[PDB]
Symmetry: D3
Subunit: 308 residues, 6 copies
Amino acid sequence: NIKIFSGSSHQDLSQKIADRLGLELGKVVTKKFSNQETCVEIGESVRGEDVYIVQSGCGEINDNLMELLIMINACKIASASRVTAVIPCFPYARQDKKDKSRAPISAKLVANMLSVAGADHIITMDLHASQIQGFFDIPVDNLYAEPAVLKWIRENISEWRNCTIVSPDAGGAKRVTSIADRLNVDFALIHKEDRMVLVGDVKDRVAILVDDMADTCGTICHAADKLLSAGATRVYAILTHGIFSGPAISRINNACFEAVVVTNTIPQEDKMKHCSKIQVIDISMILAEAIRRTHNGESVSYLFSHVP
Amino acid sequence: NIKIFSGSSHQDLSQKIADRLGLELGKVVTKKFSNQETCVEIGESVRGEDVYIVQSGCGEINDNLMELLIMINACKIASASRVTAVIPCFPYARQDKKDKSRAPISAKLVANMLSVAGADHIITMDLHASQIQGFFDIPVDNLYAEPAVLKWIRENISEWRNCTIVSPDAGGAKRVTSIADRLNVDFALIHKERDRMVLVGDVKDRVAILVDDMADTCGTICHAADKLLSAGATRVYAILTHGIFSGPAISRINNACFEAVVVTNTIPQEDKMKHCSKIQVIDISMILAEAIRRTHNGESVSYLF
Amino acid sequence: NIKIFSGSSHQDLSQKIADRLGLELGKVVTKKFSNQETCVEIGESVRGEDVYIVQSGCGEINDNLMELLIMINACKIASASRVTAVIPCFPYARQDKKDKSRAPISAKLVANMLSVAGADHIITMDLHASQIQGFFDIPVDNLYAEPAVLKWIRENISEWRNCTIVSPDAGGAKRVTSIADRLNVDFALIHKEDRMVLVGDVKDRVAILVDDMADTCGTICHAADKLLSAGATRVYAILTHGIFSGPAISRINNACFEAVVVTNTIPQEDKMKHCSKIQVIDISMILAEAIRRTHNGESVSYLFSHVP
Amino acid sequence: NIKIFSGSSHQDLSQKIADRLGLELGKVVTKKFSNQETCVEIGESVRGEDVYIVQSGCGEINDNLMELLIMINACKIASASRVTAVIPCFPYARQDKKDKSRAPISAKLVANMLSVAGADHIITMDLHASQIQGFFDIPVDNLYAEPAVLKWIRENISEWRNCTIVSPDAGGAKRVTSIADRLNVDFALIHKERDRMVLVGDVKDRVAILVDDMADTCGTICHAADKLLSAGATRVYAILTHGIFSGPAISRINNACFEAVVVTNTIPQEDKMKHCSKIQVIDISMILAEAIRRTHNGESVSYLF
Amino acid sequence: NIKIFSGSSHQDLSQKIADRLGLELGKVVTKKFSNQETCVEIGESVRGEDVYIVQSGCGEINDNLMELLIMINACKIASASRVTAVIPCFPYARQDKKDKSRAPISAKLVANMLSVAGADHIITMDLHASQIQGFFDIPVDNLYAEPAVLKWIRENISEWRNCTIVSPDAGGAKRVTSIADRLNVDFALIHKEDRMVLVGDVKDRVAILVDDMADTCGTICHAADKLLSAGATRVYAILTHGIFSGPAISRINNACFEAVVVTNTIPQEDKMKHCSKIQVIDISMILAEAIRRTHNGESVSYLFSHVP
Amino acid sequence: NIKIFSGSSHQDLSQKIADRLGLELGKVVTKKFSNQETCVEIGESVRGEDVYIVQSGCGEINDNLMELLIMINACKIASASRVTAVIPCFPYARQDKKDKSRAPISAKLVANMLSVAGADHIITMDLHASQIQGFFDIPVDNLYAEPAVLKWIRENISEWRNCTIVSPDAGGAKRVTSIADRLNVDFALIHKERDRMVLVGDVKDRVAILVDDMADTCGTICHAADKLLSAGATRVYAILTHGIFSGPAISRINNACFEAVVVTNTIPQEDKMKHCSKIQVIDISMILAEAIRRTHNGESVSYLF
Ligand SMILES: Nc1ncnc2c1ncn2[C@@H]1O[C@H](COP(=O)(O)O)[C@@H](O)[C@H]1O
Ligand SMILES: Nc1ncnc2c1ncn2[C@@H]1O[C@H](COP(=O)(O)O)[C@@H](O)[C@H]1O
Ligand SMILES: Nc1ncnc2c1ncn2[C@@H]1O[C@H](COP(=O)(O)O)[C@@H](O)[C@H]1O
Ligand SMILES: Nc1ncnc2c1ncn2[C@@H]1O[C@H](COP(=O)(O)O)[C@@H](O)[C@H]1O
Ligand SMILES: Nc1ncnc2c1ncn2[C@@H]1O[C@H](COP(=O)(O)O)[C@@H](O)[C@H]1O
Ligand SMILES: Nc1ncnc2c1ncn2[C@@H]1O[C@H](COP(=O)(O)O)[C@@H](O)[C@H]1O
């Protein structure tokens, strides 16, 4: 009575998850109508079932968000026992506060929408701010890429015992100090004032830029130059969410990165074809395991510091 | 105390409404971030004000819906006294029942999202099903294009007194009989055999007017027009309140035998009127502006029905 | 842990349902106090149980509605695992819109009342408008009489392959075309302007008036005359809900119907005694089966086009 | 800005209230359809108005309750600014606890239905249990008949200074001690042995006044009166705020030894006063009208307590 | 999958309950931060578990209430299957109405807080007013001390067949008549006007003052004098909740009580050390049994008139 | 129409606010019953009024929180038009995430309790995390001490133009870079090795100003000051908006090398300034009073940011 459904035609990650659980993805008719309205029909009974819907990897976020909400709704009114939204990269997470401005908190609205659509549980990876768990009243499991990142560092960078973990911004300090302490190495922080400042020593060390996401990549690219200017041996960037919109791929191809490392929370295949610096960490096992534990009532806490 | 804001790049209807009320549209930045995420910034204080957000006309339904919800949210947490969503064409209204499938009721989800976003009131025109009003617990005013459609028929069709109001499908029966009763004329109905088309009612030697709440790809309305011609209708008109016209619609209309296709201003038509000569629009900005002023003043809105 | 309860002293339908499930109806003290207030007490534990309450067949709708709400409430606060309202004929369904008027949407209020009383699930047959499912946030199963109606037609009307399915009003068009297409026959539509108009051919054919309900029967009786005037061979009327209030029974006894066919969503025994034209389709098996499937997490979709 | 509407055929209390406020009752059609379903139609715009619906006095509790809820709903979706339910006698108030049974708390269900219907405020008189106020999250004003009952006792009973205020049962203890303390007089209590009746307190050679929130079949109050007579009470009175008087109540009172039975105007009594001479009514329309005006004006309503 | 947790360091009652169920109390870090903020961490997984949290016996009610709410919250967002608040003595129960005053109904706010914190079920003993069950929408089990009180009376007071059960106030009448009828004895009632009045005969009989709680004990102490003045042979006081704040212990030591009997809904050990008149009825078995039944879907109604 | 009430025995901030608005504090009895239960009684009618409750300064966080919630509840069921909670230092704000533990989000629970109590609006100062605003669905105005802190630095520190704004931990990075950018000065950060302290950034031969949202036991801030001294900082200041100062805090500060510790008026400091000479307070009553007046009048509150 566990049922996994995928969004749109980006089965990629959701197929890996379903594979790892020994399951076929449930039958869904999932497209757009002529007037661009989202079209969904659940192709099998979900009555009394433990349902998991994995958010599509299309790229048009509002389409994918609506598709997800519509799928949640269809399953809830079709008498699913429980519906869990598996949202590897949480949409609108960077709008999680007003910022001294007359702005929306779109991440709270998104939480409210998921809730009224009928979500009983959220599974996500590396929320932009941990406080977003509090934007819901339903339980959220915020998985970490940290264990898989630590693992990637230790087996891919020889100098890891003498590297510096660097935040590209002021907001990422906690995350980098946390990784630096686990590895027992130094940390540094970049802050943009339209000019960057670096605090911390990177001289004659490998520098690893660590952030939760990379979008247009303006920031990591400038930070990498800054670090080389400060005497870093070579620069890596490791993000969980590889968004890479706009000129990101052009920017990465022209930057001084040894490698840009991301998870597959977002589909990366097409971006990798035009960008050889990108390497992907498969996190499908961490997601599959969290679903399996969720379903069985077993500890998901294991995953926060352990790689399956 | 009153503030009107518009969604994104379409401002034409919103401007017309603001004009009729002696107001400038509120300043707002409505864009998309690099990654396609909707960006909204309310450019002025809305604290203690009666706010009206008029839904955009920028085609991408999900972007327009998210933009609307975000605007509502931003206004509500910025201490607006009241927030009304003015949504001329209600999105997802055709998904208002399961229809024997394991389907979503997307129109109820939309109602729930608008409500949780913080809408206190909905103003809309010709809901696909009048029951959608009950998908909310907040008040909805469902305005009708009918009086204006009635006006247009009497004013533009010379043989209107001996005409037939035709429904493109089985579902639109009540809509056309209402119009046929008002004009004291005949009605007829078309149905697709579940496909061949069947017509019930007399259209021979008389002007046939196809009436429906909306026309999308216009496949139904264009096939219906052929069938009405074969049945000996003098000339065929198509009158829809919501002119979506997506996909092959414009090419289909031009190839069809329509004397005229009449739509309201609920969706922008300017772009489509340029490539389709037989389209005429009824301006409905006065109905909407008048519902906003009357909503704000506590005056009767039923007069407009 | 399935428990069926019945409303008031009209056990009739609910006893048939309980019979078909191999169950006795749960013990309820269910009456009115002296001041006409509804009196309910659940005579056995419902703690952790899957509870089904079938709406009474009394006739005083507000009494029956309140009784149902009170029973739902008593079971919810008595720690029932789930409470399902089995409402064969949904009250106030004809007040499902404003109708250009300053009117209530009583069907939405009724939905809101059921929800706040503690209903987790609704089972009903042939909602007056399918959009009423959207008046709830909880799952609703809207069963169809269509399969049993098609079955009744094919085995009771010899001329069924050459009949016309007729809507008594403009609102019933979809329903009749749907039945006409399945049978592969013609459809027609009556519309009242205080004068009726018929569109569609009924000449020298059996006419079957098909609607969701028959109340005072003014409309079906006038439509039957109209159809005979248009050359119909004989007229049948088949409704799911036989309300038959006011002068309906007198009206049917004086009309030109071959037969008036209804379901037992409403008790019909007393009405049949004073009206020989009425025949009943037993739908207790469709209801019993939907409860059994609901309880077991099995497909209720089977019932929408299949007769058990 | 203020509108008072009445429930169904009983308009007497509602008229008295509307009179005291210089208003006509709002026009509304309150009927039943052929199949017993409650029909309601608000005959005028309530948009932006402060609406008060006064619960009917047409006996059938479930019809009256549904009529009230439907009226509230119709007003709320018709964009009333605020809707207050004025419910002199709160329905289902005696079902306010489980009482060791697998029973409903019907009074909470009623509170929940009123709230979901869209009531913003409740005005009522002498709730069976004062805790019912907490069955809502909306404000409730619970008015008391006590000051008017006190007035009536002093005004109509000559030996009131040496009288005893008697409770018909164990539950009504706090109600009678409150009244006995206010008049500086004795109290006593009756209890049914779980039946024989037991009396605690002195009533010998003094006027006994039975006080309770309500009298329904009047079996308790009539048996209590007999027991009070056997205990040597000079004369026995019965004073209840809510005079339901269902079933054999009227015949029971006439056969009983009551000097007078006093009730308020919370339920219509005119019909019953014709067949029962000893019933007197305290008009409470002024208390209710005054709570409505004060609710509307933001003035103190506690003065009326 | 039953898990019992206790509040603060007053494991006392909760340990007895856990003992009787064959369980160890779940691991909780439960204290105050330096700024007096409540500190909680659930020391084990509660995912998919049936969770019971027993309210602490500290004495600082607002601390204990917040601790409970915080524990409920932590368990709910940690994916507990169900969370039940076991609140032997319900806080703020004496603020269950306005009382002709511009007062809060704090007991309703407390109910609303428990509900929004994530409580699915309440287990309590002898609510100050039964109407407080209606302050919730979730099921409440209001257990009675009555069976254990009747038992205590019959085996500790020889003259029980000829005693008088006395209410210390007007509000306790129903409770005492109920006990008096079961025992088949007389009842009496005290009412404070700043002077007490007694109605009912206590002359040459054992008088038992019965109330739901004893706080400062001003009222029971004055009532006991009054009863002796009226000719009672000896006076007992039996309350379910022994609060005994302020000068209660001094007051009881100086009063004419044969004995003051309370339950262990509140810890009593320290109070008994300074007051020899106090005897305790252990109600841990009634609570343990209600939890066990709750968990198993078995009848809790048994406990309302039966002692396990 | 406006009413300001204060929580319990601390009235100093509340008086200052009421003074600035030309008002007396509303009469309210805020005590504890014998058994430690919070007692509240609203001493006047709040019916139809815009009510502001200013959170107490009586140290016991749970008593103060319950007192606030009870006051809100009493006002809401007493038919206040609107209830705003003015909470200078938001309780449980540090518990705003799970932080890898099976922990509560106590700040969300608090948000939910305030909301269910009946708060319509929150006014607070320097939320520990700005995301706490989204723990509500009601509007929150999050005021900043920053402009006043900026003023104090320029006004009281002579070498401010060549100074360094230092963060006591990793988390406070964004707070100090904001201040360093505004003054056009350097920033630095301290981190505890997970313990030895590490400093990143230049502080040698320049005045170092430790800035944080709050200081509790002051262990972090005092150890940070030592490390800043060892790194050759001329003089060290500590500036916090919320000066909790619990436990050994006062003794720690006196033993530390601080030139001055600056806090706002969000928590009472009078008692602590008597035993700690280096503490200076910025009065923030004008910011709060001004947000209340502007909230009430519908005027811009963003001006104060
Ligand atoms: N999809 C997006 N792409 C780029 N920037 C965004 C997006 N959503 C929000 N923002 C902005 O990013 C900032 C969030 O700050 P932080 O959370 O500290 O990175 C805010 O100023 C937002 O306006
Ligand atoms: N945006 C849309 N475009 C085309 N068809 C739709 C859309 N939304 C819903 N539908 C379908 O339209 C069909 C008929 O709707 P109706 O005319 O209301 O009976 C249903 O089967 C829906 O699945
Ligand atoms: N119980 C009832 N009996 C008769 N008519 C009703 C009832 N409830 C609602 N109506 C009316 O029936 C009409 C519903 O239209 P329709 O849904 O198209 O049949 C509305 O005008 C209602 O006022
Ligand atoms: N309308 C009613 N008529 C008669 N008795 C009722 C009514 N509603 C509830 N009751 C019962 O009255 C009894 C006593 O109520 P109370 O006086 O509040 O203790 C309870 O056992 C209820 O079941
Ligand atoms: N913790 C408490 N201690 C003492 N008295 C209280 C407490 N809580 C509420 N009260 C008061 O006790 C009375 C409750 O009345 P009753 O419920 O009849 O005992 C009210 O006047 C309350 O103000
Ligand atoms: N009142 C409090 N006093 C001390 N520490 C707290 C308090 N509330 C939460 N914390 C802890 O403070 C730590 C750091 O919070 P933050 O500075 O937001 O990362 C977390 O691990 C919390 O458990």
